[PDB]
Structure formats: structure tokens, C-alpha cells
């Protein structure tokens, strides 16, 4: 989806294999705020939210707590105490076409900065003057959505990047989304120090 209408998916009731997505050797950027990524399979939470969208390579810096710009102020904001991960990689093969791809947009004009995890799809004409717009474009009445010029011959600076943000929410619920548990071989007829499931 576009960054201004990012898509959320709620993941629950399943055994997440976090350390396998860690070592894909595919993701250019992998960060984890508040949770160390080497200990992901032993801390388990109630719900995990996944948010996916597409931005350009120079704006990936903005997808982080405490950052400001155009993406972090009008499109997608993360709180100060975000606990989760941000994963991004370069998808110039799928999201750009010779001459450009004109199906990915981003909001450019807004009255005020977005609150954390707020999604807006309103397309009313932005009033940049004190003049009522009455829905007809012109001077001081601009359309708020600007397209991306995704051209395959750019640098990596303007090259498209796909971003997935995982939000590990913990409410006071018995934490259904837990990771895998290694189960060693079974040995018999020796004084052993067993630990069965419980």
C-alpha cells in the first residue's frame, strides 16, 4: 500500500518464528527498538501488529521514534516509546517502471501533524490561503496527494523501499503469541535432570 494509507494486519494465536526472519540476508535495514533481536523468541506478547507501505530510500531514516520530516509528520508517526522492529529492503524490480511508476502516492499538505498510529485517507482540497476552496483547484487550493517518480535508473537514494513495522503490544492478557521451544532428544535409564513442558 501507499504510505499515506498504510495497511495494518493483526497477528495472533500463532507461534512466531522471529529469528528466522532475522537472518534472511535480504533486508537492507533491520532495527529493533526496546527489544534486543537476539532474544526475540523468549519474550512473548499479546498481539503483534504489522504495518506495510512503500517509501523512497532517503526517507527510511525518518521511520524511527523522535524523527520529523514529511513522512513522519503527515503520513506515519511512531511514539517516543515504540517497542518493536522496523524492516526495509530495496524493491526496485517490482515497484518501478521504465519512465516511472505512478501508482504510489504520499500526502504532502495537511493542517497539523498526525498523532501516533493515525491513518488518514481524506482527499479534500487543502486550503493554503484564507480563501474558501469549494472543491475547485487553483491558487492556494492544492490537491494534497503527490505521486512518486519511481524510475529504475535513479540512484539508491530515490529508489523505492518496502517497509514493514512490527508493533509488539503487551496488555494484561495471557500472551498468546509466543515463540518456539527447542526439544532435545529423549534419554532413558540414567539419573537425568528432566524438564518436561511444565
Amino acid at each position: 500500500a501507499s504510505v499515506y494509507a498504510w495497511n495494518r494486519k493483526r497477528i495472533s494465536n500463532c507461534v512466531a518464528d522471529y529469528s528466522v526472519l532475522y537472518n534472511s540476508a535480504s533486508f537492507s535495514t533491520f532495527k529493533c527498538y526496546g527489544v534486543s533481536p537476539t532474544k526475540l523468541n523468549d519474550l512473548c506478547f499479546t498481539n503483534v501488529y504489522a504495518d506495510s507501505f512503500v517509501i523512497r530510500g532517503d526517507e527510511v531514516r525518518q521511520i524511527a521514534p523522535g524523527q520529523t520530516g514529511k513522512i513522519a509528520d503527515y503520513n506515519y508517526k511512531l511514539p517516543d516509546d515504540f517497542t518493536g522492529c522496523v524492516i526495509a529492503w530495496n524493491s526496485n524490480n517490482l515497484d518501478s517502471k521504465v519512465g516511472g511508476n505512478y501508482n504510489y502516492l504520499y500526502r504532502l499538505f495537511r493542517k497539523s501533524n498526525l498523532k501516533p498510529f493515525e491513518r488518514d485517507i481524506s482527499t479534500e482540497i487543502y486550503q493554503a490561503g484564507s480563501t474558501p476552496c469549494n472543491g475547485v483547484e487553483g491558487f492556494n487550493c492544492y490537491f494534497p496527494l503527490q505521486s512518486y517518480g519511481f524510475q529504475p535508473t535513479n540512484g539508491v537514494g530515490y529508489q523505492p523501499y518496502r517497509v514493514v513495522v512490527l508493533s509488539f503490544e503487551l496488555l494484561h492478557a495471557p500472551a498468546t503469541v509466543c515463540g518456539p521451544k527447542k526439544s532435545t532428544n529423549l534419554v532413558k535409564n540414567k539419573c537425568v535432570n528432566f524438564n518436561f513442558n511444565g
Epitope: 486550503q127 480563501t131 487553483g138 491558487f139 492556494n140 492544492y142
Partner: antibody, heavy 123, light 109 residues
């Protein structure tokens, strides 16, 4: 201070192409829009075109539609106009004008004006 | 795409008398998108009236436009030696933005 500082006088020859620029300073340039006009000596003002700083959308008159380009750079806050396929009937003073904007909502008329660059066309 | 005939052709009055310029459009325009500018000999023009009825900032209080439906006016309610210049009307409606011919004011001698 709210101002536009423009380039210097230029002398060009027919058939060539000319490029003029004006740099914004003293206000929030990233939300305003810039319009370009021209004037002969003692003649009426003529509207060349206009451009939005943010999106970059442009509009040109019918006379100049096929032989002018308007561009901008946010990094240095500069506006550029290129006029091509010159003729001797283009010797004039060129002005860029923009409204004073500060980042939230802004004025409803082109209040800020440049000092104009004199372009001479002669072989 | 818009015809803005300006009247009068020239204005010839002494310092103190009052003047009424006008800009006449051959089709309808909205008063929120018409502006009057003033250019003194040799300098860049400075905005005078925006919205056809709202003054600008720094302009004296004497100056005041009117701005009716499609037939716009400009009353200078006393003329100084500062006041002699050329004045233009521009329209901001989506059609090609046009200017008037421009009225020049000279001092009655």
C-alpha cells in the same frame, strides 16, 4: 528579511536558450508558489507562467507553452526559468513573484517581488 | 481566455483630487481572485489590493479598492505627489492569468 534575490543581466543571441534564477530568503519557501512575468520597455506586463513550490505543478500561457520550462530546488530554495528558441522580440525585464508564507497558512496575493533581470537578444 | 479592458486610458489630475480606476472583465470572475498592483517608473511593482476589496500590509489607509461582481473598481480618495504611477489589474482564475493595459496618472499642470 522577506525577499527574492535575482540573477544578473544577460545578453544572448537569437536561436539560443536562456536560463534565469531567483533565490528566496526570509520566509517559509516550501509552501508558497512562484509566478513569472515579463515586461518590455514601457509596455504592459505579460504573464509567462506559474509553478507550485511543493508539488512542482506548472502552468504556462498559450504563447510560451512550447518554449519555456519552470523548475525549482528546495535544497537551496531557488526557482529557475528556461526560455528556448529565442527571437529578437524577447528583449525585456523578467520578474518572479511569490506570496509570503510561514509553514501553516499564508497570504492571498503575490506580495513579494524580485528586482527583475534584463535580457537582451541581439546578434 | 479573459478580456480585462481597463479604464480610463490615462488619468490627468492635480495632487489632492480623487480618482476612480476600473477594470472590466468580459466574463464573470470572483472577487476573491483579483488584485491591483502599482509600478513606479523603473522599479518592480508592489501589490496594492488583494481580494478586490481587502487592503495589503503597509499600504496607507487612504487607498481602498471596491471589487463588485465582474466589474471591479479602485478609488484613490486623495492624490499625492507620491501617487503618480501606473496601475494594473490581474485575475487569478484558472484561465490564463491576464493583466490589463494599465492606467497611467499624470499631474495636471
Amino acid at each position: 528579511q522577506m525577499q527574492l534575490v535575482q540573477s544578473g543581466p544577460e545578453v544572448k543571441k537569437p536561436g539560443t536558450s536562456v536560463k534565469v534564477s531567483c533565490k528566496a530568503s526570509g520566509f517559509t519557501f516550501s509552501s508558497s508558489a512562484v509566478q513569472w512575468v515579463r515586461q518590455a520597455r514601457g509596455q504592459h506586463l505579460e504573464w509567462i507562467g506559474w509553478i507550485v513550490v511543493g508539488s512542482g505543478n506548472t502552468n504556462y500561457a498559450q504563447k510560451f507553452q512550447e518554449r519555456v520550462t519552470l523548475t525549482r530546488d528546495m535544497s537551496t530554495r531557488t526557482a529557475y526559468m528556461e526560455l528556448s528558441s529565442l527571437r529578437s522580440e524577447d528583449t525585456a525585464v523578467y520578474y518572479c513573484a511569490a506570496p509570503n508564507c510561514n509553514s501553516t497558512t499564508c497570504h492571498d496575493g503575490f506580495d513579494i517581488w524580485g528586482q527583475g533581470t534584463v535580457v537582451t537578444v541581439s546578434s | 481566455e479573459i478580456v480585462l479592458t481597463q479604464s480610463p486610458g490615462t488619468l490627468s489630475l492635480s495632487p489632492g483630487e480623487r480618482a476612480t480606476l476600473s477594470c472590466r472583465a468580459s466574463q464573470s470572475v470572483r472577487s476573491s481572485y483579483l488584485g491591483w498592483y502599482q509600478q513606479k517608473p523603473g522599479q518592480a511593482p508592489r501589490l496594492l489590493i488583494y481580494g478586490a476589496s481587502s487592503r495589503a500590509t503597509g499600504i496607507p489607509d487612504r487607498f481602498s479598492g471596491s471589487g463588485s461582481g465582474t466589474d471591479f473598481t479602485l478609488t484613490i480618495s486623495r492624490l499625492e505627489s507620491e501617487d503618480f504611477a501606473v496601475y494594473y489589474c490581474q485575475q487569478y482564475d484558472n484561465s490564463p492569468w491576464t493583466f490589463g493595459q494599465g492606467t497611467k496618472v499624470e499631474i495636471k499642470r
